[PDB]
Design a protein around this ligand. Structure first.
Ligand code: CLA
Ligand code: CLA
Ligand code: CLA
Ligand code: CLA
Ligand code: CLA
Ligand code: CLA
Ligand code: CLA
Ligand code: CLA
Ligand SMILES: CCCCCCCCCCCCCCCC(=O)OC[C@H](COP(=O)(O)OC[C@@H](O)CO)OC(=O)CCCCCCCCCCCCCCC
Ligand SMILES: CC1=C(/C=C/C(C)=C/C=C\C(C)=C\C=C\C=C(C)\C=C\C=C(C)\C=C\C2=C(C)CCCC2(C)C)C(C)(C)CCC1
Ligand code: SF4
Ligand code: SF4
Ligand code: SF4
Lengths: 144, 63, 741, 39, 73, 165, 80, 73
């Protein structure tokens, strides 16, 4: 498996434009780019409002936050059975692949993944707050 | 063969459980080395609408 | 392509098997109760027909039967009003003295001391003074005896049984197919011609043959017992020819295009009747004739089974300009397949027409001795206004429901709806700005006036004496309406209403209708009304446009139309659903309509209603609206503190019940604050403690008690808030207008 | 008739009949014994 | 007299609410069940359901009777 | 007498209040005829007023300075000065009916608890069993005291769910 | 950022991962349940705190917990 | 009148005490939130799961008790 490379010269779905598009954050902080492969032309619903028409083949779109890209990904997977993927793009031109992280969707187990933020105990086995008091900052009893 | 008999009634001893100090019917006991092999089904559902849960060997007492 | 009567025979079997199985309509409730929440759900999804099944035919059939059951309930209500007027009323006595005897149609049983409510309403009767205006309506139709009202009650009961039988028959014996319901062209043709046109023509015939001669004789001084019966007037031409010479010519002038011969019962008198105070029934009869002809003409517009007529889809597709893209493409399919969209349109226009009815009824009183009954006028205006506002909020709610459930983006690519969703942010931002601008320029004037009056600077206020803001447009329109019967209405004798200008009409020493003058206070209150209407529109339109998605939650449509929140994430997503927008719109509608009814009551009691003295007309409050309505302190002292004296001292008289309700309504409203300022987590833990107490004594029910849901808590709070506030204002208005009116 | 009796045995119908009976009994008691303040 | 009595009573009400609020803060932040094992403090949480239930019964009885007598009068 | 109050049979404000009520009723009655329904209704109300005042004064109630009766809630004062009918006897009457309703409901719940589907017996009331228990609840204090003595009235601590503390 | 934790009571039903709307959770191999899978949170920097995962968890008590922490641009879900 | 208003005062005191005491005892946890002690004294909620957890923290109990204190005073 290999990490995909963002192609900026990728056709985009035919949309007339809306007011729920990108804002100054896309030029000052970061934005997201969702790409997918469509087998045929089809009218889909935009996460920011309106109905667009996805073209046959590659399709690229820009969104303000990751939630919009994952919402469109879920819509394309559950309504048209596609395989979309998205990146986070910075104003300096840096592209960072986000989902799927390993090329395999996270609902199914995949080899090579390492569990993080996992507590090898239960909720009732957590310590009292008095034991985590007077720390460097506000620490919850579940953070340890 | 380890654990309560299938179909019996046991009491839940887990304090954080919704069915603490409540009776539930045993469904199946896993034969592996899992932490919570006993499966207990209850007639009354929790706040999430669930009636089955997995408890440990020492978390259930025969009653 | 063919309009016919499609139907299915015996689809559902008439049995009581499902009556013993609660929650059978939904798959989730069919399992049975396990928690108390289920019970509430059983009542929340009862009429939610598009949630039980996805079949449009089943939903349409259920809607049809629900309509029949509703009409049966309405017929039972009307039959009850007629029966109460025929056996527990003083209508016969009120007919002999409609200016001194108070209308009453409800008696109470002598138990636990409630007999004090049976006040002396006049005419040798003891009861409760009614404000529905049924006495005036029965007098307008020519009813002169209790036997006619009793017969009408029996007919209403028969009609109720017929409506119920029709609902049962159309649901279990002959249920129409989906293609029969989708014949909107034929449906509109029939509702325009048949229903409206034939109803107006039939009422015109009754008014010409019964209301006109009976009411003319009543206004001529004839005793109600000596007036000929309606069938007597309908059987011979001598009596009608004596009362109206045009009747001596028969129906011959109608077919010979000599309608001018009928100029004795079909005129343009205008104004009001100087004897009764209401509109001339000859003008109403002519009105109904014209309305019937217009609706009958309009009923032949759409094509049904022949070539002539129109196709609404063709007209919708033919309307497309350069600034709207495709246009109305797909709107016909939207309205012919979604009941919620049609419900939204119908509820909006219906509520608007209800408010228009309230305004037109106080301005142009059509019933005899209606304007002199200030209680009936105030109650009718307030009631119709509240019904209109509620229907408008429901329209917004169903628009949001359609946007969440029945909307499909595959059929709305570049139409008007898609473009509206595309620029919804611009729409909401501009409406928000205009709401802020109106709020500042509407409330700041009152605050500035309160400050200047408190600071001892009355010359710096916004009043007639100080800086004045005269509504020049409304005054000019009033002058144009007053001068209309001389230049633009040569065939009209008087103006449409007396509120424009001219001489006032008074009946029985009480002012029936006098001209209304607008000043600075009227300008300020009108801007207040505009601001409140704009804010209510903002909340409803925001909940409709942002129902599917938003910049905060892009998959709101997946969460449904009615859901509590999306969690405490993103800083907090409390009340993001369209249901919550309807919930907030209800409060704003209550605030708006409350200010509207307060303004109506103060303006009518200050510059219109009042007694008639020798060389001068004295109003109820003395005309203090043009001097005390420009400040909040004036509204609180002169209109709320001064006018509430009647409802607080009503104890010991026939209006004491109102005072009791005035207190009870203050309770329910405050009770609402318990469900609006709290959350279900606290109540769930408290219920857990109570459950422990029950478990200790082995009295814990099998059905686990669960606190009300978040959405249920909001609905309960808004329901109690609306009921408490509306009942408070109802008691205050009724007690005051009955004591001094 | 079994289904009809089961429907009449539901919580709202039983509550309506019971409250009507209790209210009627209290009303008739106050009717035949007007203004009872003490025993 | 009126202003002084009302001022002190409202201040006392706010201070009482603060006392109970800080008690809750003590239970969440500074309570140690292992150090307070079997004492009166642990026994308070041992039968808290009974306390809340009896307080609910007293409040319900007082509310129903006071409101009923007022509405009757 | 008790707390500076005087009996209603010897209070001037009580008689003045009765005369005020009869005066306003008679004033309202003077506007009607003699053989009409409102006149008969007003005369019936006046007779009810006279009977109510006579019965209240006959009962030995204690009136205040406002002419209205007062209730004695202290058991000692009520049983010592003949005021047990105000607040004592109705207290025991409510206790009997309250425990009656509570015991009937408790018996119905415990009876339907051992069945297959108790929730159905809760939403759909079993009229025969409920009627039998309603008729059998007349001995509720005896049954409750016998239950308390046997130790079967309460549930043990280990069989009740509690919070994780 | 918010603190997302997975406890040992996780049965590996993968319902919490599907309910996550910002791709924070995932499934890793494990040996403590029959499914031999366990939920993981390696991208907590994108979590907003909607608690949809807690709603989708069927264990009693929950196996996945969300604790509101320091708010940022990604945590507040701001498009500006 | 003094007797009745005193009963109203007792109702206000008992209800305010009920809300405050219940919030202080349920601050460390209950059946709805077995780990409320790990979330601190003040937090928004536990989300819409488990039927809804609006105003579940002890801070919210104090919040609802302030209204009863104002009403009692
Ligand atoms: C001239 C023909 C005619 C007339 C008078 C009506 C009248 C009415 N229709 Mg209808 N309709 C018609 C043709 C007609 N329709 C056709 C051709 C179609 C098929 C395209 C439909 C399909 C239709 C639907 C789907 C619905 C209605 C509904 C209604 C009622 C609306 C309630 C109301 O506010 O009005 C005022 C109320 C009254 C005046 C009450 C008095 C009712 C009297 C008896 C008038 C009934 C006349 C009607 C033709 C029935 C007579 C036929 C006979 C077999 C009994 C109303 C009574 C709604 C409904 O179902 O209500 C139950 C509704 O949902 N209609
Ligand atoms: C829908 C409204 C309506 C109705 C029902 C009527 C009805 C009537 N109008 Mg009228 N009218 C109306 C509107 C209406 N009008 C309006 C809007 C105006 C203003 C333009 C007038 C102005 C007007 C005038 C000036 C006069 C009437 C008159 C009449 C009466 C006689 C009609 C006539 O001249 O012979 C018309 C003939 C027919 C209608 C035929 C009747 C068909 C019958 C019912 C058939 C029955 C057959 C059946 C199978 C028999 C078998 C039964 C079995 C048991 C054996 C009649 C009862 C006259 C009158 O009352 O004299 C005082 C009269 O002079 N009207
Ligand atoms: C032509 C009128 C009309 C029709 C046909 C409908 C139809 C529908 N509405 Mg709707 N609505 C309307 C008007 C209408 N509405 C108006 C005027 C409003 C503004 C208040 C609303 C606001 C509204 C909301 C917010 C919602 C609906 C919903 C629904 C759907 C489910 C049915 C339901 O409400 O559950 C069952 C009905 C009830 C449980 C009745 C409630 C009884 C109320 C609370 C009592 C009213 C107090 C009473 C007047 C005073 C009594 C005094 C007391 C002492 C006894 C259904 C298709 C729901 C939905 O979309 O489904 C998903 C939804 O959430 N409606
Ligand atoms: C929002 C409603 C409102 C309005 C319309 C006014 C209006 C007025 N107040 Mg008042 N006031 C208000 C609210 C309001 N007040 C409230 C709520 C309070 C209580 C806190 C007060 C307390 C108060 C006091 C104590 C006093 C006033 C006074 C005044 C008068 C002079 C103020 C002034 O000169 O400032 C200057 C205003 C400006 C510099 C800006 C004016 C706004 C411009 C015209 C809008 C421009 C936008 C334009 C359309 C953009 C075009 C776009 C592009 C194409 C160019 C004035 C007529 C004084 C007075 O009594 O007069 C006798 C004074 O003593 N007010
Ligand atoms: C908790 C509050 C409360 C209390 C203690 C009372 C108490 C009383 N009310 Mg009252 N009332 C209340 C609230 C209350 N009410 C409210 C909220 C309202 C407004 C709806 C009313 C409105 C009201 C009215 C209108 C009247 C009363 C009356 C009465 C008296 C009637 C006694 C009786 O029924 O005869 C005896 C009852 C029985 C014998 C039934 C016994 C039960 C079974 C059959 C026997 C078992 C016994 C062992 C009584 C002392 C009546 C009265 O005359 O006042 C003096 C009366 O007219 N009440
Ligand atoms: C000796 C008295 C005393 C002391 C030392 C403390 C100390 C503390 N309290 Mg506390 N409390 C007290 C009394 C006291 N309280 C009382 C009487 C109440 C009842 C009102 C409360 C209720 C309370 C709650 C609910 C909470 C605390 C919390 C806290 C802790 C930190 C929060 C803080 O104070 O930040 C700073 C405080 C503020 C910024 C005050 C907020 C601003 C207020 C609302 C001002 C509004 C007044 C308004 C502007 C008036 C002008 C009107 C005019 C313009 C018209 C802190 C250790 C918090 C805590 O423990 O953290 C977990 C916590 O949640 N207290
Ligand atoms: C006028 C407003 C109002 C009212 C009446 C109440 C009433 C109540 N509150 Mg509440 N509260 C309010 C406002 C109000 N609150 C506000 C604004 C807040 C801040 C959010 C709170 C926060 C709050 C909390 C946090 C708590 C309460 C609690 C309680 C209950 C206390 C127990 C009691 O006194 O028994 C008396 C019972 C009553 C007064 C109920 C009224 C009786 C009705 C009128 C009789 C029914 C009428 C008739 C028979 C049927 C009509 C219905 C019809 C449709 C058929 C009580 C029901 C406490 C509690 O739950 O106690 C266990 C609790 O913990 N309140
Ligand atoms: C619910 C709380 C309550 C309260 C606040 C009171 C309050 C009172 N009770 Mg009492 N009482 C109660 C419950 C209550 N009672 C109950 C449940 C019973 C049933 C067992 C009694 C039965 C009772 C009797 C028999 C008497 C009082 C009496 C009194 C009054 C003075 C005696 C005293 O304070 O000691 C507390 C009362 C007791 C411990 C009960 C025993 C009586 C003691 C020993 C006082 C007797 C000595 C003597 C007669 C006092 C009178 C001195 C002087 C005036 C002659 C006093 C106002 C006395 C009274 O004033 O007579 C009219 C009286 O004799 N009560
Ligand atoms: C009012 C002007 C109506 C505007 C109007 O209808 O002009 C007419 C213009 C022309 O539309 P079309 O000719 O393309 O429409 C044809 C089809 O919609 C079917 O008729 O419509 C629009 O401009 C829509 C854009 C909204 C215009 C935004 C202006 C905002 C002003 C509204 C504020 C009210 C105060
Ligand atoms: C008769 C009389 C007398 C006596 C008196 C007495 C003995 C009393 C009292 C008293 C009391 C007895 C009082 C009280 C008070 C109390 C209060 C006001 C409360 C509360 C609060 C609290 C208790 C808190 C707690 C807490 C928590 C919650 C947690 C932990 C910590 C803390 C502690 C904070 C004499 C002879 C001398 C004189 C004359 C009169
Ligand atoms: S929903 Fe809960 S039990 Fe299931 S995989 Fe996620 S954390 Fe584990
Ligand atoms: S709180 Fe929401 S975004 Fe965060 S891990 Fe859970 S489901 Fe995902
Ligand atoms: S407080 Fe209630 S409504 Fe608001 S986010 Fe939390 S659970 Fe949802």
């Amino acid at each position: 498996w290999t990490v995909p490379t963002l192609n900026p010269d990728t056709p985009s779905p035919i949309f007339g434009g809306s007011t729920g598009g990108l804002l100054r954050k896309a030029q000052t902080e970061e934005f997201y780019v969702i790409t997918w492969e469509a087998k045929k032309e089809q009218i889909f619903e935009m996460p920011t409002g309106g109905a667009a028409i996805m073209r046959q083949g590659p399709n690229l779109l820009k969104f303000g936050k990751k939630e919009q890209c994952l919402a469109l990904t879920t819509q394309l997977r559950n309504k048209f059975k596609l395989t979309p993927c998205f990146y986070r793009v910075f104003p300096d031109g840096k592209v960072q692949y986000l989902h799927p992280a390993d090329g395999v969707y996270p609902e199914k187990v995949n080899a090579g993944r390492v569990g993080a933020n996992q507590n090898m105990r239960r909720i009732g086995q957590n310590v009292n707050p008095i034991k985590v008091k007077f720390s460097g900052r506000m620490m919850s009893p579940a953070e340890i | 063969e380890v654990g309560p008999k299938r179909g019996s009634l046991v009491k839940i001893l887990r304090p954080e459980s919704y069915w603490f100090n409540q009776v539930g019917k045993v469904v199946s006991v896993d034969q592996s080395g899992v932490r919570y092999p006993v499966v207990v089904r209850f007639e009354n559902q929790n706040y999430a609408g669930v009636t089955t849960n997995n408890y440990a060997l020492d978390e259930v007492v025969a009653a | 392509k063919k309009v016919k009567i499609a139907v299915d025979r015996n689809p559902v079997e008439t049995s009581f098997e499902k009556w013993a199985k609660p929650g059978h309509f939904s798959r989730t409730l069919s399992k049975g109760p396990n928690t108390t929440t289920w019970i509430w759900n059983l009542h929340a999804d009862a009429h939610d027909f598009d949630s039980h099944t996805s079949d449009l035919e089943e939903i349409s059939r259920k809607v049809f039967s629900a309509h029949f059951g509703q009409l049966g309930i309405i017929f039972i209500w009307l039959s009850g009003m007629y029966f109460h007027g025929a056996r527990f009323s003083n209508y016969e006595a009120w007919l002999s003295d409609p200016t001194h005897i108070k209308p009453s149609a409800q008696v109470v049983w002598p138990i636990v001391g409630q007999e004090i409510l049976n006040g002396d309403v006049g005419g040798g009767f003891q009861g409760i003074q009614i404000t529905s205006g049924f006495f005036q309506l029965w007098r307008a139709s020519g009813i002169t005896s209790e036997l006619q009202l009793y017969t009408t009650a029996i007919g209403g009961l028969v009609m109720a049984a017929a409506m119920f039988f029709a609902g049962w028959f159309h649901y279990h014996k002959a249920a129409p197919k989906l293609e029969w319901f989708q014949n909107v062209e034929s449906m509109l043709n029939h509702h325009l011609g048949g229903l409206l046109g034939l109803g107006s023509l039939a009422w015109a015939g009754h008014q010409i043959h019964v209301s006109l001669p009976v009411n003319k004789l009543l206004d001529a001084g004839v005793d109600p017992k000596e007036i000929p019966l309606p069938h007597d007037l309908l059987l011979n031409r001598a009596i009608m020819a004596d009362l109206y010479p045009s009747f001596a010519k028969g129906i011959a002038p109608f077919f010979t295009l000599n309608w001018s011969e009928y100029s004795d019962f079909l005129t343009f008198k205008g104004g009001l009747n100087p004897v009764t105070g209401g509109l001339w029934l000859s003008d109403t009869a002519h009105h109904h004739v014209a309305i019937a002809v217009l609706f009958l003409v309009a009923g032949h517009m759409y094509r049904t089974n022949w070539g002539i007529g129109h196709s609404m889809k063709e007209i919708l597709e033919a309307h497309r300009g350069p600034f709207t893209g495709e246009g109305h493409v797909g709107l016909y399919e939207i309205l012919t397949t979604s009941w919620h969209a049609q419900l939204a349109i119908n509820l909006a226009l219906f509520g608007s027409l209800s408010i228009i009815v309230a305004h037109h009824m106080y301005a142009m009183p059509p019933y005899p001795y209606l304007a002199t009954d200030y209680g009936t006028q105030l109650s009718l205006f307030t009631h119709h206004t509240w019904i209109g506002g509620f229907c408008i909020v429901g329209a917004g709610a169903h628009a949001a429901i359609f946007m969440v459930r029945d909307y499909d983006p595959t059929n709305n690519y570049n139409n008007l709806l898609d473009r509206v969703i595309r620029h919804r942010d611009a729409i909401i931002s501009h409406l928000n700005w205009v709401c802020i601008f109106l709020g500042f320029h509407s409330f700041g004037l009152y605050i500035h006036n309160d400050t200047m009056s408190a600071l001892g600077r009355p010359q710096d206020m916004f009043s007639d004496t100080a800086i004045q803001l005269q509504p020049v447009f409304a005054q000019w329109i009033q002058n144009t309406h007053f001068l209309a019967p001389q230049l633009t209405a040569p065939n009209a004798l008087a103006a449409t209403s007396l509120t424009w200008g001219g001489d006032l009409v008074a009946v029985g020493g009480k002012v029936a209708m006098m001209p209304i003058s607008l000043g600075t206070s009227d300008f300020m209150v009108h801007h207040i009304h505009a601001f409140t209407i704009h804010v209510t529109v903002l909340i409803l339109l925001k909940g409709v446009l942002f129902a599917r998605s938003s910049r905060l939650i892009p998959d709101k449509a997946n969460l449904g139309f009615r859901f509590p929140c999306d969690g405490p994430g993103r800083g907090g997503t409390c009340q993001v659903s369209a249901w919550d927008h309807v919930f907030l719109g209800l409060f704003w509608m209550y605030n708006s309509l409350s200010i509207v009814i307060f303004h109506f009551s103060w303006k009518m009691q200050s510059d219109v209603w009042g007694t008639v003295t020798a060389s001068g007309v004295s109003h109820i409050t003395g005309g203090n609206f043009a001097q005390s309505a420009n400040t909040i302190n004036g509204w609180l002292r002169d209109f709320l503190w001064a006018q509430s004296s009647q409802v607080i001292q009503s104890y010991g008289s026939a209006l004491s019940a109102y005072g009791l309700i005035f207190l009870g309504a203050h309770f329910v409203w405050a009770f609402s604050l318990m469900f609006l300022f709290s959350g279900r987590g606290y109540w769930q833990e408290l219920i857990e403690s109570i459950v422990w107490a029950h478990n200790k004594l082995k009295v814990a029910p099998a059905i686990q008690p669960r606190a009300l849901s978040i959405t249920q808590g909001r609905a309960v709070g808004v329901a109690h808030y609306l009921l408490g506030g509306i009942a408070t204002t109802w008691s205050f208005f009724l007690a005051r207008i009955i004591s001094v009116g | 008739m079994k289904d009809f009796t089961t429907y009449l045995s539901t919580a709202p119908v039983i509550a309506t009949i019971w409250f009507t009976f209790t209210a009627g009994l209290l009303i008739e008691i106050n009717r035949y014994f007007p203004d009872p303040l003490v025993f | 007299q009126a202003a002084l009595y009302t001022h002190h009573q409202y201040i006392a009400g706010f201070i009482m609410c603060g006392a109970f609020a800080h008690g809750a803060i003590f239970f969440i932040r500074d309570y140690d069940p292992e150090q307070n094992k079997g004492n009166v403090l642990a026994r308070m949480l041992d039968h808290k359901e009974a306390l809340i239930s009896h307080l609910s019964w007293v409040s319900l009885f007082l509310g129903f009777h006071t409101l009923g007598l007022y509405v009757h009068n | 007498d008790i707390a500076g109050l005087t009996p209603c049979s010897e209070s001037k404000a009580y008689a003045k209040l009765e005369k005020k009520e009869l005066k306003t009723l008679e004033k309202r009655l003077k506007q009607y005829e003699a053989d009409s329904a409102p006149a008969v209704a007003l005369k019936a109300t006046m007779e009810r007023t006279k009977a109510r005042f006579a019965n209240y004064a006959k009962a030995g109630l204690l009136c205040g300075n406002d002419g209205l009766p007062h209730l004695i809630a202290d058991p000692g004062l009520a049983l010592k000065y003949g005021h047990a009918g105000e607040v004592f006897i109705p207290t025991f009457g409510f206790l009997y009916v309250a425990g009656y309703i509570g015991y009937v409901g408790r018996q119905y719940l415990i009876a339907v608890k051992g069945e297959a589907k108790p929730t159905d017996k809760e939403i759909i009331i079993d009229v025969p069993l409920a009627t039998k228990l309603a008729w059998q609840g007349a001995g509720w204090p005896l049954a409750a005291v016998q239950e308390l003595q046997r130790g079967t009235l309460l549930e043990k601590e280990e069989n009740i769910t509690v919070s994780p503390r | 950022a918010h603190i997302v934790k997975i406890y040992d009571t996780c049965i590996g039903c993968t319902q919490c991962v599907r309910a996550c709307p910002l791709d924070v959770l995932e499934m890793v191999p494990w040996d403590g349940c029959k499914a031999s899978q366990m939920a993981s949170a390696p991208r907590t920097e994108d979590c907003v705190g909607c608690k949809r995962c807690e709603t989708a968890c069927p264990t009693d008590f929950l196996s996945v917990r969300v604790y509101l922490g320091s708010e940022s641009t990604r945590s507040m879900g701001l498009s500006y | 009148g003094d007797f009745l208003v005193h009963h109203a005062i007792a109702l206000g005191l008992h209800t305010t005490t009920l809300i405050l005491v219940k919030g202080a005892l349920d601050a460390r946890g209950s059946k709805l939130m077995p780990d409320k002690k790990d979330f601190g004294y003040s937090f928004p909620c536990d989300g819409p799961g488990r039927g809804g957890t609006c105003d579940i923290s002890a801070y919210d109990a104090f919040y609802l008790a302030v209204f009863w204190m104002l009403n009692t005073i």
